[PDB]
Short mmCIF file of C-alpha atoms and ligand atoms in Angstrom, two decimals:
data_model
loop_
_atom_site.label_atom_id
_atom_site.label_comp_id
_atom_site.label_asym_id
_atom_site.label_seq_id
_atom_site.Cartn_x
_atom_site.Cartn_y
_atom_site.Cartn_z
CA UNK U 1 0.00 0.00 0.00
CA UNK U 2 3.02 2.73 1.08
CA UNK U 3 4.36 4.16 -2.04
CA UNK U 4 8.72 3.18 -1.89
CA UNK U 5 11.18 5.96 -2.59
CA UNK U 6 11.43 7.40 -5.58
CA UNK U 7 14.32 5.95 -8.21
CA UNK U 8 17.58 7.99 -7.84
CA UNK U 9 17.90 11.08 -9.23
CA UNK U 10 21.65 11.81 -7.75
CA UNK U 11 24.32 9.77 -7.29
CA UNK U 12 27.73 11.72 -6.78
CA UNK U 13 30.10 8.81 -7.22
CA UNK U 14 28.32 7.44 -10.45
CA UNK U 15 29.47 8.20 -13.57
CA UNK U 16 27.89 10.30 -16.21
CA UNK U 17 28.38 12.88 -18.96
CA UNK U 18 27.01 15.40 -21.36
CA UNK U 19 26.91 14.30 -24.71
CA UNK U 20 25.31 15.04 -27.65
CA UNK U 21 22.92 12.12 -27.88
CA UNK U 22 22.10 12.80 -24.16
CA UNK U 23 21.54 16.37 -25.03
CA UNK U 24 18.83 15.10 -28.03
CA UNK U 25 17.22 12.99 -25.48
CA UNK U 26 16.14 16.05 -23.56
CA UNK U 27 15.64 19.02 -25.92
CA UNK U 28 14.12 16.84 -28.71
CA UNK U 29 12.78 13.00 -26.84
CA UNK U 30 11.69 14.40 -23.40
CA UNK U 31 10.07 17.25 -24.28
CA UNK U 32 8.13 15.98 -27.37
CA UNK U 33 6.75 13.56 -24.96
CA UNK U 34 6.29 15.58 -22.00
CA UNK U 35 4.25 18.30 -23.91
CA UNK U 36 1.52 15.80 -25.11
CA UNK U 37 -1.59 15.89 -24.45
CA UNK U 38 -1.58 12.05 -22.67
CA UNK U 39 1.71 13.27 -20.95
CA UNK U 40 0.04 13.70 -17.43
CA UNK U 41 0.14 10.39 -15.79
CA UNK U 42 3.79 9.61 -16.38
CA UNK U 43 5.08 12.98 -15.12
CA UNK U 44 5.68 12.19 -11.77
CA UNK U 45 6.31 8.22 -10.08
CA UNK U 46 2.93 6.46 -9.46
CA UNK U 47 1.47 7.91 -6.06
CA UNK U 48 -0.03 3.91 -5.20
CA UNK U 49 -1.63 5.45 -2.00
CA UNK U 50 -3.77 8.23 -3.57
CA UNK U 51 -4.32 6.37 -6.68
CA UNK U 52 -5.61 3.14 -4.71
CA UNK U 53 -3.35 0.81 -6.36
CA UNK U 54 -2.33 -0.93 -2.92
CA UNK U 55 -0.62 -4.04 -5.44
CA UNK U 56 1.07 -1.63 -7.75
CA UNK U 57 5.03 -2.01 -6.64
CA UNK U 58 4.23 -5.45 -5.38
CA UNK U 59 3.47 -5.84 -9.52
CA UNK U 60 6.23 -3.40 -10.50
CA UNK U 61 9.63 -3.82 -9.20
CA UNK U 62 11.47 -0.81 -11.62
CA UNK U 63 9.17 1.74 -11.41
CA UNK U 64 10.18 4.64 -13.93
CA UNK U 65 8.33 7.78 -14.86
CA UNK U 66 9.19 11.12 -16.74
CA UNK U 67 9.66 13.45 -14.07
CA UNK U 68 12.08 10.76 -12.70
CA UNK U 69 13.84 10.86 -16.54
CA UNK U 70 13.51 14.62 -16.89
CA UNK U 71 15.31 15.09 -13.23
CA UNK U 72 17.99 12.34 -14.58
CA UNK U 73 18.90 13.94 -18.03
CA UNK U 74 18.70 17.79 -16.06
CA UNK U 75 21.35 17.17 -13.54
CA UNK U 76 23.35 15.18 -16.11
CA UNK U 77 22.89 11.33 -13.93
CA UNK U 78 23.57 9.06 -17.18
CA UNK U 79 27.13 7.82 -18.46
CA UNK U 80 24.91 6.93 -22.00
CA UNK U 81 21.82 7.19 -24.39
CA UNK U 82 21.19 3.80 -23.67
CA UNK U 83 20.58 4.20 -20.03
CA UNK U 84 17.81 7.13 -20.62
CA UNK U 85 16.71 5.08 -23.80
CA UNK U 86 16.03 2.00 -21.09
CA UNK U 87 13.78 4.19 -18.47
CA UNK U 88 11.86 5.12 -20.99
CA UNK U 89 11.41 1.67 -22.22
CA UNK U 90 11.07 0.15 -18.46
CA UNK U 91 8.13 3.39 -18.10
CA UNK U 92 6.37 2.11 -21.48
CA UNK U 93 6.71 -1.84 -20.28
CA UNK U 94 5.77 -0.99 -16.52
CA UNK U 95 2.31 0.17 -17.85
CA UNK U 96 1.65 -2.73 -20.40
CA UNK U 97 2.75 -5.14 -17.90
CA UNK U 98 0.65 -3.60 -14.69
CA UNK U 99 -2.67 -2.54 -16.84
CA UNK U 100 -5.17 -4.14 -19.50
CA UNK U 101 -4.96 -3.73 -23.24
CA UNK U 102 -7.42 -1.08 -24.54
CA UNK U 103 -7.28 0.66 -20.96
CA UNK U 104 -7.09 4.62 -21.16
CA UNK U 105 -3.64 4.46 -19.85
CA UNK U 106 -2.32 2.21 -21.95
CA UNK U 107 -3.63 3.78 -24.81
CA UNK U 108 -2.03 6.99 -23.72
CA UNK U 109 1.75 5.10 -23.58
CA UNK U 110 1.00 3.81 -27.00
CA UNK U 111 1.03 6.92 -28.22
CA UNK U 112 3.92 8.45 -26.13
CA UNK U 113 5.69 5.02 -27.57
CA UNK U 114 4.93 5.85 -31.02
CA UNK U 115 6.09 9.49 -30.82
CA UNK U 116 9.43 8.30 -28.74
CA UNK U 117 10.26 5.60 -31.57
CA UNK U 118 10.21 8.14 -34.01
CA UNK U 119 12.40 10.32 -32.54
CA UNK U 120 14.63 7.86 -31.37
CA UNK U 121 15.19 6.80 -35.17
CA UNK U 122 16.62 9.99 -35.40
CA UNK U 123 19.12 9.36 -32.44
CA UNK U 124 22.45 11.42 -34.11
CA UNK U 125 25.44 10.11 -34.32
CA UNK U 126 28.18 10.05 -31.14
CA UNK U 127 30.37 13.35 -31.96
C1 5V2 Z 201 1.82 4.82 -14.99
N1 5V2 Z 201 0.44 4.89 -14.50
C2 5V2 Z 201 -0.10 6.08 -14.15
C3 5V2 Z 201 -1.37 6.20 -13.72
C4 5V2 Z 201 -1.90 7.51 -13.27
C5 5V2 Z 201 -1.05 8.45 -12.69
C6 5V2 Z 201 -1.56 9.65 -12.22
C7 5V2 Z 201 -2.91 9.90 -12.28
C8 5V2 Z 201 -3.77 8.95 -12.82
C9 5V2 Z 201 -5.24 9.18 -12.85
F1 5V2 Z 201 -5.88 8.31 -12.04
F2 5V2 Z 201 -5.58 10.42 -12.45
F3 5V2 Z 201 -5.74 9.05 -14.04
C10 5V2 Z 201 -3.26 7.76 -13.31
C11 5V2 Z 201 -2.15 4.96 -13.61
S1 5V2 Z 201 -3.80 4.80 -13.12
C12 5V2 Z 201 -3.75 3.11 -13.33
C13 5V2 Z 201 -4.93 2.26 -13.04
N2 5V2 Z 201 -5.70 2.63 -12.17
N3 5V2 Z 201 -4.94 1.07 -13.73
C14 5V2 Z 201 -5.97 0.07 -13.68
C15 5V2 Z 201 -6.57 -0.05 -15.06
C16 5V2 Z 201 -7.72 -1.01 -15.04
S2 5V2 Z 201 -7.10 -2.62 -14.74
O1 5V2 Z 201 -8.20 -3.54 -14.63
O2 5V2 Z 201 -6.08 -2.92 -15.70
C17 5V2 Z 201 -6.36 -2.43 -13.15
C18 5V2 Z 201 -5.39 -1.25 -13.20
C19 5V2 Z 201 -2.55 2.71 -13.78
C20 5V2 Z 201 -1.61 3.74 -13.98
C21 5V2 Z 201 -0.28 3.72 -14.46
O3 5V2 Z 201 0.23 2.60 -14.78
#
């Protein structure tokens, strides 16, 4: 029932850097998502408690949301594109694995997923 901490959004000792697909992943991936319309739910982790979802992180065990990927890329917390590229995946999954198909909210990832495949087709090259 309790919601768990949320996932790390500093680490001091971890490695990380700025790079230019990192850089894509927030000016053109995170905020093409974030600004759409079905956007809302994965802003911020799942709140279990208010949402009366008392099974929720008994189901999920990698919880991963948007605000926790927009706080990630902002204070620079990756070494790579593929760790950002995997929270969003583990987000998208989370939902499909925890909810019904055809429910509103998985409808609304679908089309967050479509949107962040196209842009991540567009990944540029390591400089
Ligand atoms: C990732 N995520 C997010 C939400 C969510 C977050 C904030 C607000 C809201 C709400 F309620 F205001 F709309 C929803 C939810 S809500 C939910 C939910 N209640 N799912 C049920 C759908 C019907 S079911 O029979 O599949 C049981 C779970 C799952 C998720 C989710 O994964």
């Amino acid at each position: 029932s309790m919601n768990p901490p949320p996932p790390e959004t500093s680490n001091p000792n971890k490695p990380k850097r700025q790079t230019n697909q990192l850089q894509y992943l927030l000016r053109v991936v995170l905020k093409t998502l974030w600004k759409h319309q079905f956007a809302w739910p994965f802003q911020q982790p799942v709140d279990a408690v208010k949402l009366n979802l008392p099974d929720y992180y008994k189901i999920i065990k990698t919880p991963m949301d948007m605000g926790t990927i927009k706080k990630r890329l902002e204070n620079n917390y990756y070494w790579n594109a593929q760790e950002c590229i995997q929270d969003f995946n583990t987000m998208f999954t989370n939902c499909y694995i925890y909810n019904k198909p055809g429910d509103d909210i998985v409808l609304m990832a679908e089309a967050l997923e479509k949107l962040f495949l196209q842009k991540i087709n567009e990944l540029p090259t390591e400089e």
